[model samples]
Target: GSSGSSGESYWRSRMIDAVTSDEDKVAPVYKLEEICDLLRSSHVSIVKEFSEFILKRLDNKSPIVKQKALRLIKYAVGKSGSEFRREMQRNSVAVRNLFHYKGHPDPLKGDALNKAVRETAHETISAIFSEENGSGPSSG
Candidate 1:
């Protein structure tokens, strides 16, 4: 079955596939990077959709996947700039997950994957809470 879809939905589908995938091999990272690059040139709407997928990835069963998702947010913010940040601040689901990641009820809380996730998140926090504009919003 072959049907032509608009480029927007096609790219959106590809992004969703990459985010939700759980392959431990190198393929997933490569695919994610490709999509990340594509997102760099995409509209703010696409980045917003990708951010939603990231929320799903964070809640994935695999810790490695979660780690990557955390890392991906930093990349998203770095590349997409204020839109990603605004979207993140507006939609706090993924942000909440990242903040609560360290507090998961798993017995092995301090594993390598978890540590990496924490580290990525710490770095991402720095990326998020920066003085992009001169004295704009109130801090919490």
Candidate 2:
């Protein structure tokens, strides 16, 4: 346990801050595929913490952020263990709400990006739903 504003463990906060950073305005801090690397290389706790952190970002106002968050979530959910997947299955309702979470999109890039984010979110929700309901895409 930690007492930071995030109240998550120190490493968890650091990883989340590092990935959510803006210093790399020239590019994404964490690419969609890099989550696969995290899946292969990191402990389940790190992956789990990142999954939890990224899920909250699905609620972000910025669709670009949401897009990245959604991508990360799809990978994390797909790669995680049964316990994590089962827990996510229990929270599926709120997750599905993101299908229209941002409401009407902005007239600018926001509209296009929001649409893209929603599309990815749909795939994410569908995949996770099928997994927990019996498909069991993730296993120990």
Candidate 3:
């Protein structure tokens, strides 16, 4: 696996770095979508590394970052399938964080973005983890 004529591998590195960026500025939807496209056509190692790298972004302190990561994960699973899911299984705690998330503590309760992020977390998890027993939350 040492010799193949292809575009710069460094470009792939930059792609990973760009989407996994730590900036509070919400990552572009186009970037995440681009990754999904890449994931669909990529080889095994590409999927593996993407999972390894992107999974950590779940814990990003910035809600925007976490939101973007969550959205990307939805697509990642959609595009990459079992390989990505297996990676998530190994990093299940990170996924659990999203399940238990209650949004950021905004005193004014005006962080609509945070609320949206929490909602996205719930929606994403429901779609992914709703397999097997369908014991959804009670609405009292």
Candidate 3: residue 134 Cα off by (Å):
11
Task: State every prediction's TM-score relative to the real structure.
Answer: 0.61, 0.60, 0.65
Candidate structures ordered by lDDT, highest first: 3, 1, 2
Error of 2 at 27 (Å): 7.1
lDDT of 2 at 130: 54
For residues 52-139, write the lDDT of model 3, one tens digit per residue. Answer: 6677677667666666667777665655566666666676467557654656565554675465566677655654554545455656
Q: What does candidate 3 score in Cα RMSD to the true structure?
A: 5.2
The sequence of per-residue lDDT tens digits that candidate 2 reaches over residues 1-140 is 36334433545544444454432132253555465455456554654565666666665566566666555555656665554455566555645766865556665555676576667778778656653356556587
| Prediction 1 global C-alpha lDDT | 0.60
Cα lDDT over the full model 2: 0.57
| Candidate 2: regions farther than 4 A off | 1-8, 17-48, 102-110, 132-140
Clash totals, every prediction? 0, 0, 0
Query: Residue 31: error of model 3 in Å?
Result: 2.4
Q: In candidate 2, which residue pairs get closer than 3 Å at backbone N, Cα or C atoms, i.e. clash?
A: none
